[PDB]
DNA sequence: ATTATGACGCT
DNA sequence: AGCGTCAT
């Protein structure tokens with residue numbers, strides 16, 4: 001009743017760039033704009049592996065993880081941009097730098113949590129309160145929400161997409177009580193107005209388009225963002241949750257896309273998020289653990305409390321390379337040469353990071369995979385990172401892994417290594 | 431022969 | 442610590 005929390009205390013948005021690496025390449029090369037195109041890494045093996053796909057190319061069935069040679073079978077006119085290669089490996093610097101451009105703009109509007117290279121959460125609770133004060137009971141015009149969808153509308157008693165969007169928006173605005181500064185639906189709407197402004201600023205100042213979700217927590221905001229892509233934003237209200245969740249496969253909710261989600265489905269014999277409401281909190285904790293059970297109990301009701309953490313910079317800086325099949329490293333010289341290549345890229349990134357961000361990494365983590373192991377990482381060891389020097393880092397990395405060598409011969413390496421990974425961690429202010 | 435990342439949970 | 446899960 002009156003004491004039942006409804007998880008409507010915050011306004012949270014998730015902003016996510018559309019086909020990000022493709023946009024970065026299209027900005028740089030106008031010949032790729034408005035074309036089916038994709039970004040690929042490496043080229044020798046099957047034309048390279050696709051890592052990003054324009055919406056025009058998606059229409060042909062082109063997807064991430066596809067080999068470009070195979071993508072060309074679906075889309076003969078597909079255009080390709082290659083990830084830069086430095087020191088024998090893919091170098092993602094251009095995309096990281098583009099990400100900083102966007103994150104810096106978002107940070108003008110509110111505190112952000114960097115969630116990935118091209119997405120960030122925003123806690124808009126305070127900004128909304130402020131904007132509500134300026135508005136002073138004044139209604140919100142549809143003109144302020146030119147790219148916003150209201151999930152679940154229109155409903156009740158045009159055949160074009162944009163017509164539908166406007167009908168839903170009108171029904172929503174018609175029902176708003178702008179007289180109540182504490183109305184959660186009103187707070188969400190003002191949140192959406194701010195996100196329109198943020199998205200406009202990103203596009204004006206970078207050229208990049210994005211989508212966004214606006215809701216009361218991170219999980220719903222993330223789910224919302226994907227409902228209308230590309231170049232649109234979606235508002236998911238508390239009230240929209242029962243219908244939305246009633247046919248929402250469990251795997252669509254962030255964190256349920258893997259083994260836990262599969263177990264929820266198997267153990268409970270359900271398919272959709274909404275079906276979770278029929279279990280008690282203790283029942284859910286019994287199957288999935290205290291933490292997961294409480295989380296599920298609240299989440300299936302649209303409630304989640306994970307905060308938007310104030311963190312704009314990555315917490316680790318890493319460099320990794322696979323050596324698949326016949327390329328696996330089988331000699332000590334090979335292993336040392338590649339550790340050096342990685343260490344050199346890492347040094348470059350670390351030095352730039354120290355200058356830009358006034359911090360220093362203090363731990364170096366070294367990870368490898370051995371041929372045969374189904375696991376992505378086979379072994380992880382740490383050592384001290386006391387100097388930003390690639391030769392030292394690579395020597396140190398070799399020292400911590402060298403005993404993994406089964407080979408009786410000093411010069412040979414067995415079993416061959418199929419992955420090397422160096423990661424700088426544990427930053428301290430400097 | 432997906433690859434290159436990056437955050438967080440468990441013990 | 443070192444490993445696993447989940448994600449982009």
Ligand SMILES: Nc1ncnc2c1ncn2[C@H]1C[C@H](O)[C@@H](COP(=O)(O)OP(=O)(O)OP(=O)(O)O)O1
Nearest residue numbers: 016017018019020021022051052053117118229449
């Ligand atoms: N599995 C991956 N391997 C390598 N790079 C990836 C992978 N997934 C995503 N990326 C990179 C390239 C993407 O452009 C960027 C952002 O990813 P993501 O948001 O999932 O898709 P996207 O921005 O390309 O398309 P969308 O418009 O669907 O969001 O990160």
Ligand SMILES: [Ca+2]
Nearest residue numbers: 016017018019
């Ligand atoms: Ca994206």
Ligand code: NA
Nearest residue numbers: 016116118119
């Ligand atoms: Na993303």
